[PDB]
From a paper:
Base-J (β-D-glucopyranosyloxymethyluracil) is a modified DNA nucleotide that replaces 1% of thymine in kinetoplastid flagellates. The biosynthesis and maintenance of base-J depends on the base-J-binding protein 1 (JBP1) that has a thymidine hydroxylase domain and a J-DNA-binding domain (JDBD). JBP1 specifically recognizes base-J-containing double-stranded DNA (J-DNA) through a JDBD which has been structurally characterized. In the context of JBP1, JDBD recognizes base-J and then probably invokes a conformational change in JBP1 (25, 26), enabling the THD to initiate the biosynthesis of base-J on a thymine 13 base pairs downstream the complementary DNA strand (J + 13′ position).
Notably, the crystal structure of the JDBD had a missing loop of eight residues (529–537) between helices α4 and α5, including the Arg532 that is important for DNA binding. Remarkably, in one of numerous datasets that have been obtained during the course, the missing density for the loop 529–537 was observed. As this loop follows the α4 recognition helix and harbors the Arg532 residue which affects DNA binding, the diffraction data from the CSHL 2018 course were reprocessed, and the model was rebuilt and refined. The B factors in the loop range between 53.5 and 125.2 (mean 91.6) compared with a mean of 65.3 for the JDBD structure excluding the five α-helices. There are no crystal contacts observed for this loop, and there are no substantial differences in crystal properties overall. Thus, it remains unclear why the 529–537 loop is ordered in the new structure and not in previous experiments. The final structure was validated using MolProbity and it belongs to the 100th percentile, with a Ramachandran Z-score of −0.98 ± 0.72. Here, we present a crystal structure of the JDBD including a previously disordered DNA-contacting loop and use it as starting point for molecular dynamics simulations and computational docking studies to propose recognition models for JDBD binding to J-DNA. In this predicted model, JDBD shows a similar overall fold when compared with our new crystal structure, with a noticeable difference in the loop between the α4 and α5 helices, that we found ordered in the new JDBD crystal structure.
Numbering used by the authors: 392 to 561
Amino acid sequence: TNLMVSTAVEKKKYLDSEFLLHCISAQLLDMWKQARARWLELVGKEWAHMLALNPERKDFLWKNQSEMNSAFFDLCEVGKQVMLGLLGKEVALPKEEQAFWIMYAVHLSAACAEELHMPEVAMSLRKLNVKLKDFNFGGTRYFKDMPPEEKKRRMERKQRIEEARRHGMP
C-alpha cells in the first residue's frame, strides 16, 4: 500500500501529456487534456473564493452538487479510458486498476499543490480517494439524486470516450 503510493509518486509524470503521447489515441489524449484543465480551473476558482473568506484554512470543502464535482466525475470517466488505452484492453486486472487509481490520485493531488498552489493537505489523496470510490461504484451512488435523463447523458458521454480510446472504432 505505502509502496504502491510511493511508486505512484515517482510516476505521477506518467499522466503528463508528453508521457501519454503515442501510447493512447490522439482523440483520447485531447479529451484527457481538456478534462484535466476543466477540473483544475474549477477547483482553483472555488479555492480562491474560500480563501478570500478564510485566508488561514487548509481544508478544501468539496461541494456535492457543484460544477467542479461534475467535472471530477467526467475526469474519472476519461481517466478510466486512459488506463484501458495504456493497457490495450477492455477490462483491467483488479491489481492494474488499483495501481492506476493510485497514480491518478497522486497526479491530481500533485497538480493542486504545484499548479494551483494549494496547501498539500487541502486536496489529499484521501479526499480524492473517497470521491474515486463513489465513481467506481457508479453515477447513481456518486450523484445520490440523478434524474433519469442525466443518467443517459453520462452513459452517452462514456460511450463517446470509449470510442475515442478505440481510435473511433466500436
